[PDB]
Design a protein around this ligand. Structure first.
Ligand SMILES: *C[C@@](*)(O)[C@H](CCCNC(N)=[NH2+])NC(=O)CNC(=O)[C@@H](N)CCC(=O)O
Lengths: 122, 247, 248
């Protein structure tokens, strides 16, 4: 059973690049980026990552305008202690947030980002 | 009077629980097409919506933009050395979904002759969302992991899993857009796979089969907690119609 | 990975069953992928960044000029033609062919490349390491398509390692596959990366990183039937390679 997934913690960018009047322009297939537990994830790095992903689908065309107010950067795992499932969630900001450990529970947690971002196209 | 579409001319097989599944009744799935490059092997599938128009998966059209380098095989069961009445039309124009979703339209340089071995599939009502555990059929000459059938048209009856569930952390972890559906047994074993892409995900609705999906992607094949992802054709029936009416 | 180790891409590689006959890769998911260019002219051969100052390639990629300062490696690329900003183009100081040659040579970068998330070396295998049967490997390279075509964009192609016992099994190749050679791909084809990709890497995954298990040198066709591709088995020359860098 080896049809792989990220081995360590990864950010997974699944964003629909639309215009400002909401109209869709690009729907780039999701892409996952390895992020280290301990680093800080700022508004800046998220965008380096949203771009990094728009290019993977529509290369060098398009650029990001407004990510979107909804900081849909949440992570879910199973808490073996609470004996329930925990869904952490962080904000996209200039100050960022430190990437939690979570190894205690999950080997490869995915810090999902799923928002419509306003791109304009270069 | 007259009528066709979605009503195959051979009662389809039946195997509850492509890797896994079972080989299909020769000609029970008339809308299945087989994309094959000029003097090149079969590499994806497709499904006939009109005698002229074929619905496939945009990533199969990744190689060439030239319609001319693509060929369509209609009315077959064998992947290798087809029966003598198998049709083999050539592509006229490529029409990929504009926003880069994994769906596209192939205009045939000559319409497919409708026969009891070749019948289009019925398109869904716009934006319709296939229920939760509805059992649908996936078909195609894709790969497998050394199993039951092969060079023949295999099939599989899988239950739809809702985005709500398949985007859960154990399964697909939110990689499933609203424009895609999931289908599979969490146990694995049976599933679509490479070479099936573009093929149909037909869900029986009363008298005919309705084309509810286009095979697109997935994390491995038949692995557990990893269902198969399909483009939701209901989210593209208007666009599809647009391309066909104005081309 | 922490800072920039090796065999650890900073974007998750777009896998695809399967350069020709393989999907276009996600930008910079193969940080070790290099492009060799002539003084004035452009691409012609690929390569692997083995260390910040060393690149491994196919020796026949150097047929045009013996002089080391005749080639230029390009690092951090996706576009082969136009070429974007941070895409380091180092000049080559020395060239070291491998003795008892199969086809490999070491290109020494006059200036250590700047290791970033788009440029990172590959991990070398342990001596004589034998990449197991059925292991999923990855062929990556810009090289050809409709001749010169290739979207201009770096493409890959996933191929499993065959096995020198079976690969040599009469019905396709006859002991022409030696112990210092690696046999990967399939006996149906339609994705074997050929030409203009020579010297490029064949990195196979292991636990959590990628290892340089072979060097694209040849195949015997161009993606097809009973004729798995034949790459020089890098674990055999991991010693020599290693000993070139420690001294040269
Ligand atoms: C293109 C088509 O032939 C195959 C079908 C595989 C169906 N998979 C399952 N589990 N039923 N599609 C692909 O190969 C598309 N790629 C993938 O599914 C993944 N290897 C990559 C995911 C992605 O980045 O799209």
């Amino acid at each position: 059973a080896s049809y792989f997934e990220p081995t360590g913690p990864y950010l997974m960018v699944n964003v629909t690049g639309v215009d400002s009047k909401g109209n869709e322009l690009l729907s780039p297939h999701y892409v996952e980026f390895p992020i280290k537990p301990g680093t800080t994830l700022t508004k800046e790095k998220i965008e380096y990552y949203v771009e990094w992903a728009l290019d993977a689908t529509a290369y060098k065309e398009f650029r990001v305008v407004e990510l979107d107010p909804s900081a849909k950067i949440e992570v879910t795992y199973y808490d073996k202690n609470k004996k329930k499932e925990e869904t952490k969630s962080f904000p996209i900001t200039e100050k960022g947030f430190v990437v939690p450990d979570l190894s205690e529970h999950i080997k490869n947690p995915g810090f999902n980002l799923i928002t419509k971002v306003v791109i304009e196209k270069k | 009077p007259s009528f066709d579409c979605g009503k195959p001319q051979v009662e389809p097989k039946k195997c509850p629980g492509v890797v896994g599944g079972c080989v299909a009744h020769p000609h029970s799935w008339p809308w299945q097409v087989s994309l094959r490059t000029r003097f090149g092997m079969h590499f994806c599938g497709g499904t006939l919506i009109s005698p002229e128009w074929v619905l496939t998966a945009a990533h199969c059209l990744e190689k060439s933009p030239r319609p001319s380098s693509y060929k369509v095989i209609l009315g077959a069961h064998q992947e290798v050395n087809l029966e003598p009445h198998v049709q083999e039309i050539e592509v006229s124009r490529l029409f990929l979904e504009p926003t880069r979703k994994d769906i596209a339209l192939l205009k045939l340089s000559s319409p497919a002759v409708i026969t009891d071995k070749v019948i289009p599939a019925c398109l869904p009502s716009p934006n319709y969302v296939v229920a939760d555990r509805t059992e649908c059929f996936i078909t195609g000459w894709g790969e497998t992991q050394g199993t039951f059938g092969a060079g023949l048209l295999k099939e599989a009856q899988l239950p739809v899993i809702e985005n709500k569930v398949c985007n859960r952390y154990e399964f697909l972890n939110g990689r499933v857009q609203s424009t895609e559906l999931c289908a599979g047994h969490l146990a694995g074993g049976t599933d679509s796979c490479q070479g099936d892409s573009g093929g149909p995900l037909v869900c029986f609705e009363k008298d005919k089969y309705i084309l509810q999906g286009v095979t697109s992607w997935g994390l491995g094949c038949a692995r557990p907690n990893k269902p198969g992802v399909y483009v939701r054709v209901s989210r593209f029936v208007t666009w599809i119609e647009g391309v066909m009416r104005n081309n």
